[PDB]
Write a protein that binds this ligand. Structure first.
Ligand SMILES: Cc1c(Cl)cccc1NC(=O)[C@@H]1CCCO1
Length: 185
């Protein structure tokens, strides 16, 4: 791809984080803590899952950023509506305002309803995310494999401002403590 020139500097929004997340001082890294992180509750926080939003809101144009997923067993990445549900149980789907991919149990899947199997030959250590607001496109790229396409959501009905979306995943196994990191431009 040749999307790198629409690069945007994403930072994480502490106020949206599940209360067990630890966001770095530079707001570019997030990991699951081994307990509640001593913050007050608020209506923005994702309650049921280890999720957080980027601070930036996008309502036009082309945007591109990259995320490091090295040595994680589970995660979700993409974009979502600013108005997505925060509390209780929900599925990641375009109907619920999410355009995402994930790793779970040694398989990669796109967050369609029902979910779509991804075909990845080279497990990615860094993921590129491209949004074209006007075109209604969200695309994912394998930076480890020379930028190869992972998945394109097209005919997207955003229906609102978009925010970068992250899930560090559960760490029941003890093998998923590693952070998500926003990679430099
Ligand atoms: C923080 C969290 C949410 Cl939000 C949802 C489900 C699980 C967890 N916690 C973990 O994955 C690990 C394993 C048990 C102790 O923490």
């Amino acid at each position: 791809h040749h999307h790198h020139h629409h690069m945007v500097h994403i930072t994480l929004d502490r106020n949206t984080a599940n209360s067990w997340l630890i966001i770095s001082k530079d707001r570019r890294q997030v990991r699951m803590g081994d307990t509640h992180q001593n913050v007050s509750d608020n209506k923005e926080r994702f309650s049921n899952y280890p999720m957080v939003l980027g601070a930036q809101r996008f309502s036009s144009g082309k945007m591109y950023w990259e995320v490091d997923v090295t040595q994680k067993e589970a995660w979700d990445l993409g974009v979502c509506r600013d108005s997505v549900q925060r509390k209780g149980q929900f599925s990641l789907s375009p109907e619920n305002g999410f355009w995402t991919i994930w790793l779970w149990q040694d398989s990669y899947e796109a967050g369609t309803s029902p979910q779509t199997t991804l075909h990845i030959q080279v497990p990615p250590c860094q993921i590129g995310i491209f949004v074209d607001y006007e075109a209604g496109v969200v695309s994912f790229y394998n930076i480890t494999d020379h930028g190869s396409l992972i998945y394109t959501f097209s005919e997207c009905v955003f229906a609102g401002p978009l925010r970068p979306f992250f899930n560090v995943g559960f760490n029941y196994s003890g093998g998923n403590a590693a952070p998500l990191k926003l990679c430099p431009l």
